[PDB]
Subunit: 115 residues, 4 copies
């Protein structure tokens, strides 16, 4: 599992569950090609997005649908979605965890890159 | 000034100076049209991007070029840039401050929205 | 103004207004002595806590009373308060801005330190 | 394991390893009583701090020695340590994860409280 996503909710202090996540890979014409998607689980996590064969070096974008998550909770959010854009590179450690901590008007995102 | 950008460096405890910022607006055909651009100053702030009249309702994308910034400090950062995407002015004109706190493998972004 | 405090609310996208702040300074006997206190204004800022002369070298603790703040908004927050603990002025006088971004179960704190 | 600590490093994008963590419980005279301590592991985590029998309701303080972590990396940090102060309460979910994301001049901390 070379690419994992973890989403937490900073208002409730819980995993953010059932959050839609879309991954895109940057194509040679600079457009964004759908690559992988899913919904976070009960633990706020999304696994099994891709395999080490398909996850080649390149620029990827992870798009976390935060606006629908907040609307389902009845809370009026600022952002359309959170967007994490990064280059996957074979030299460094192999596992990428993209984490996001969500508030209605703020979010943070971190990359944990390990072996 | 209805749209301003404020960038901090979380490694140096200082404003993030000369950070490039590109703003886009989603057009009717659903593409991102170039809306305004600039660089943060000595105070890590970017003002005068647009005017109330020009800053109409729509979905905006503020792209803060963090990777260029880090590289010139000799750091090799994780992200290409920070993207901040939001509906603006969809209940009448507001003032928006987009703030970003940068680390090489992390950033946070918040909005302060006030009513004229 | 050598020590100022800036507080944002990450749920409302607004300054955090009327947040109580207590600053302490570690004394020679190793206890926390009361140093200064105040409340954030309409802009979420707190100024005039101390003077350059009074703000000598030492270890300071800025306690931001976040739990009181959240409760008055009807929220039941996780933390009692944010604590920010740092050596100040140990290479000559500096200006410090302590910033905090509050959510009910999370906060972030950053320092902007500048040289007179 | 009612109380777990997770520490990440925002400059390297890795777990923060070998970080000392001291937990205190607030005594009736308002002083801080040492309660539990340890060092984060290779995965940036600290487990086995306490048991559900000893972790009674009360105010606790978790003190993460960030200054020594940054000094070991040769990086000049702002804070003496990060301090997470909170009330443990029996009504809510049972597992407390205190997470901290560290930069030299900034940190964030989040509580994930679950079942
Ligand atoms: C009211 O509008 C803002 C918003 C955020 C601000 C400031 C002003 C100032 C002060 C100034 O205007 O110079 C600082 C220092 N801000 C931050 O620290 C900051 C940076 C990034 C994040 Cl994610 C959260 C907060
Ligand atoms: C429940 O377990 C957690 C909790 C938080 C986590 C992670 C795992 C991972 C995954 C990992 O460690 O690989 C990351 C990246 N987390 C963060 O990003 C994070 C974000 C904000 C703060 Cl304030 C503190 C930590």
């Amino acid at each position: 599992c070379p690419l994992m996503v973890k989403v937490l909710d900073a208002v409730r202090g819980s995993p953010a569950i059932n959050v839609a996540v879309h991954v895109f890979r940057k194509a040679a014409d600079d457009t964004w090609e759908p690559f992988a998607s899913g919904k976070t689980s009960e633990s706020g996590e999304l696994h099994g997005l891709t395999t080490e064969e398909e996850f080649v070096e390149g620029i990827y974008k992870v798009e976390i649908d935060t606006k629908s998550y907040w609307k389902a909770l009845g809370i009026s959010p600022f952002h359309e979605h959170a967007e994490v854009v990064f280059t996957a590179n074979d030299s460094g450690p192999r596992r990428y965890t993209i984490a996001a901590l969500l508030s209605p008007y703020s979010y943070s995102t971190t990359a944990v890159v390990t072996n």
